[PDB]
Write a protein that binds this ligand. Sequence first.
Ligand code: HPA
Ligand code: HPA
Lengths: 338, 338
Amino acid sequence: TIKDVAKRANVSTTTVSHVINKTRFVAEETRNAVWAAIKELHYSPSAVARSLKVNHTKSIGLLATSSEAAYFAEIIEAVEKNCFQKGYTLILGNAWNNLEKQRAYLSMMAQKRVDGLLVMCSEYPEPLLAMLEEYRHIPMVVMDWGEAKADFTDAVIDNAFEGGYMAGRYLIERGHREIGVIPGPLERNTGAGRLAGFMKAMEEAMIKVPESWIVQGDFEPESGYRAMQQILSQPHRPTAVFCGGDIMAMGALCAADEMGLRVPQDVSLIGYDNVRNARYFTPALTTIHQPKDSLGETAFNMLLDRIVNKREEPQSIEVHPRLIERRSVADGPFRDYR
Amino acid sequence: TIKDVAKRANVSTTTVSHVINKTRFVAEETRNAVWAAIKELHYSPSAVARSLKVNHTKSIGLLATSSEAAYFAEIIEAVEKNCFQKGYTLILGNAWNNLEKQRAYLSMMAQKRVDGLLVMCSEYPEPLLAMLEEYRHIPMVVMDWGEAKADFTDAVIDNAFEGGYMAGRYLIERGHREIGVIPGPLERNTGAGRLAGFMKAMEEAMIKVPESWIVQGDFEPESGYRAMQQILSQPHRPTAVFCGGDIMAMGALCAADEMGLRVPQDVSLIGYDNVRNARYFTPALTTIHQPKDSLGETAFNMLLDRIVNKREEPQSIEVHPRLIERRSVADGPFRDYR
DNA sequence: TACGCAAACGTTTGCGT
DNA sequence: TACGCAAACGTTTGCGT
Ligand code: HPA
Ligand code: HPA
C-alpha cells in the first residue's frame, strides 16, 4: 500500500517513506503531496513490514502469573504506563504458575519477537529457571525475586525481609508478645521472605510463635478467612496477627467480624502490600507498603537500558518497603513496660 | 534463519517450512532431520515474517480504560484466558478516557495490525465514536454499551437497567422507603443506566428520592467515602443506600463505620458488580452480580466470528445481571406492612 | 512419490545522479 | 539540490517434475 501512496503522489515509495519518518529532507511541496495521499488513501504504515526490516517490534511482554490480584494488577497498570509513554506496546500473558502455560507464552512471545521480556512468575522451579534461560538471547528482567537467582537476567529486589522485620517490630513495640502469622506461599519471595523478616524480629525479642499460631495463606481472601478463623478459634489465642498480604488481610478481617471479635479492639492486625484501597478496609488497614509503581517503572527502565544501550551484564536494583500506620492496630499488654 | 535450518538439513527451506506447519507430507526421515536442525540451531520461527505473508497477526487488542479497577481487572483476565486458549496474543492498552491517548493506541494498534479490536472506553463522545469508525475496517466489538450506539461494531449488552431495577425492588420489598443513591458517572452505561433502572422501580412505588440523597461517585472508593459521608451527615437520612458499584460501596462502608453507624444495623446498603471479594467486605456485601466472565468470553467469541467467518453485519448479545444476597441489608420499617 | 524454484508480502536504505 | 533503483528482511506457496 505504500506503493499506492507513492503513486497518487507521483513520487518514489522511497520518498513516501522518508517523509513518513522524517529521515531525510523533502521539499515541502512534495512533503505535503505525500500526506495528501496518505490521508485520502487512508494509509496506515505496516509496523510488521517495518519490523521485519528494522529488526525490532517496539513491543514488550509481561509473562505474569495472574492479573486480577490487587497486588499484581497495580504492578501491571504501572508497567503499562511506562510502555506507552515510551512508545512500547504491551503484551500481557498469565501462565498461572503453569509450566506448560509458561513454556507456551514464552514461545509465542519469542516468535512474536518482543524486544525485551518482563517476568513475574511467583514460584520459580529449576524447570522454570531453565526454560527462562533458553531465551537469554531476548533481553529480560524478573521483577519478583528476593536475591538474584540467575546471571542471565536483570533483577529488581524488594527487601521483603526488611519488610517482614518492620512488621514484627511494630507489633513488638506496641505491647505485643502473643503474635500470630498467616504467611503467603513459601515458594514465593513475598511469601517466605516476608515471614523470615518477621521471624527474626521475633527471635530478637525472644517471642516464640507457637506453630498452632502460624497458618499458610495463598494470598487470596478465602485463605485469610480460614486462617484467622483457625487462629481465633482456639483455647489460647494471640493478641496480634501479622498477615502476609492485604487481601488475605481483608479476609482475616471479615471472619474476625463474623466471630464477633473486634478489630483492632480484640485482635490487632497488620498486613502487607499497601494495596490501593486498604485504606478503605474496615478498619482502615495498617500495613507495610510496597512500592509497586516504582517497582514497575524501575523494571521497564532496566529493560530499556539493555535494550537500547545493548547492555550485557546483569543488574539488580533494590527498592524499599515502608510502614503505613492506619488503624487496625492497638497497644498490646506490654506497651507500658518498655 | 529458516534458510540456515534448511541447510544443516540439506533440504529446501520450502521443506523446512512444510514440516514446521504440517502443511504437506514429508518423509519421516526428512521430517526428523529438520527438527534436528531446528533444535540445535535453536530455531524460532519468526511470526512477523510469517504474519507479513499470511496476513494476520493472530493477536488482538484491548483498548481499555484502566486495568487496576476491580471490575475491569476481572473482565480482562477473562478476555486474556480466551485469547490464550484460542492461540490469540493480547495487547493491553489503557486510554484513561483520554481522546489523544485513545487516538494513539488505536493507531499503534492498526499499524501493529491486530486481527480484531476489543473496545472498553467507558465514556463515548462523538469525537470518539468518530475515530472508532475510521477503523471500521478492523473487526471490533465494544463490550461496554447499554444499547447499540453504532452500526459498524458488534455489541455485548448488560441490561444494567434491569439490574438497577432489581436493586431498587429488593430494597422496596425489604421494608425500605427512604432510600439514597450514589451512582457512577452519568456518561457511562454502568453509571446512568444502572441509576435509571433504580429510579423506575422507585417511581413505581411512588418513593421519591430527595436530591439531597443522591450523590455522584466516580466508581472509586474515595468517592464512595465522601458520598456516604455526605448522606449520613445530615438532619434527615435514609435507611437504605443503593451504591452504583462494589468498590465505591466498599468506600461507603468504611465511612459509615468511621461515623459509628452500623451496617446494616443502622443503614442498609446494597451495591453492584459482585466483585471477586465483595464477600469479604464487612459485612459481606449484598449486591447485584455482573457476569463479567461471560461478558468477556462472549466478546471474544463475537470477534472471533467476524474474524474467521468474515462476518460483516453487526451483532449484539445480551447478558444478564442477578441478585446476590449477602448481609449488608436488613428489613426496613415497612416490611411487615406488605 | 517426495520434494524445489522463485516470486511475493510491505517496508527501509545504501549508493547513486 | 532533491530525489530514485533495487536489493534485502524471513517467511509461504503455487507450479512444477
Ligand atoms: O504472590 C502474590 N500474589 C498476590 N498478592 C501478592 N502480594 C505479594 N505477593 C503476592
Ligand atoms: O466504569 C466503571 N469503573 C469501575 N468499576 C465499574 N463497574 C461498573 N462500571 C465501572
